C-alpha cells in the first residue's frame, strides 16, 4: 500500500544450488520430490493466508520434513516444535504431499545400508 508495485509474484530463489547442497546427505529421488511439493504448497497457501513465504514454512523445516517423508500426518507435526497454526491446520495437505513423493519409485540409484546395534545393562 504505502509503497510496493504489484508487478509479478516473484517466488523463486534463482534456483540457488546452495539450497539443494546446503547440508550434507544430499536429497535422494523421493526426498527431492517432496521438497518441491512442499515449496509450491507453501507459496500457494502463503498468498491465500496473505502472509510471507518464510513465515509459513522455513527452509530447515521444509527440508527436515522432505527428508523424513512420514507416511503419516503426525510425522509432519512432530517435525516442528512447537507446531505452527498452519502445518497443523493444513496438516492434511502436507501429509498428502509426503505420500505423493513416496508413492513414486526410486529411480536407478546405487544404495548401501546395513547396521545393527543394541545394549541392555542391569543392576541386580
Curated annotation (Swiss-Prot):
There is a cross-link at residue 108 (Glycyl lysine isopeptide (Lys-Gly) (interchain with G-Cter in SUMO2)). The record marks 108 as: Not ubiquitinated. Induction: Down-regulated by mild hypothermia (at protein level). There is a cross-link at residue 108 (Glycyl lysine isopeptide (Lys-Gly) (interchain with G-Cter in SUMO1)). Sumoylated by USP36; sumoylation does not significantly affect EXOSC10 nucleolar localization and association with core exosome and USP36, but regulates the nucleolar RNA exosome activity in rRNA processing by promoting binding of EXOSC10 to pre-rRNAs. Effects of sumoylation on EXOSC10 levels vary between different studies. Sumoylation of EXOSC10 is required for the modulation of EXOSC10 effects on cellular protein translation and cell proliferation. Sumoylation is promoted by mild hypothermia. Signal peptide: none annotated. Residues 28-108 form the HRDC domain. Coiled coil: none annotated. It is found in: Cytoplasm; Nucleus; Nucleus, Nucleolus; Nucleus, Nucleoplasm. Component of the RNA exosome complex. The catalytically inactive RNA exosome core complex (Exo-9) associates with the catalytic subunit EXOSC10/RRP6 (via its N-terminus). Exo-9 may associate with DIS3 to form the nucleolar exosome complex, or DIS3L to form the cytoplasmic exosome complex. The RNA exosome complex interacts with cofactors C1D/RRP47, MPHOSPH6/MPP6 and MTREX/MTR4. Interacts with MTREX; the interaction with MTREX mediates the association of MTREX with nuclear RNA exosomes. Belongs to the exosome component 10/RRP6 family. Catalytic component of the RNA exosome complex which has 3'->5' exoribonuclease activity and participates in a multitude of cellular RNA processing and degradation events. In the nucleus, the RNA exosome complex is involved in proper maturation of stable RNA species such as rRNA, snRNA and snoRNA, in the elimination of RNA processing by-products and non-coding 'pervasive' transcripts, such as antisense RNA species and promoter-upstream transcripts (PROMPTs), and of mRNAs with processing defects, thereby limiting or excluding their export to the cytoplasm. This is Exosome complex component 10. The chain holds residues 483 to 593 of 885 of the full protein.
Amino acid at each position: 500500500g504505502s509503497s510496493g508495485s504489484s508487478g509479478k509474484p516473484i517466488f523463486t530463489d534463482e534456483s540457488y544450488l546452495e539450497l539443494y547442497r546446503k547440508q550434507k546427505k544430499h536429497l535422494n529421488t523421493q526426498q527431492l520430490t517432496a521438497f518441491q511439493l512442499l515449496f509450491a504448497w507453501r507459496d500457494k497457501t502463503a498468498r491465500r493466508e496473505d502472509e510471507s513465504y518464510g513465515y509459513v514454512l522455513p527452509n530447515h523445516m521444509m527440508l527436515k520434513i522432505a527428508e523424513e517423508l512420514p507416511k503419516e500426518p503426525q510425522g509432519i507435526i512432530a517435525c516442528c516444535n512447537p507446531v505452527p497454526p498452519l502445518v497443523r491446520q493444513q496438516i492434511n495437505e502436507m501429509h498428502l504431499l509426503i505420500q505423493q513423493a513416496r508413492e513414486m519409485p526410486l529411480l536407478k540409484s546405487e544404495v548401501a545400508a546395513g547396521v545393527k546395534k543394541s545394549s541392555g545393562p542391569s543392576s541386580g
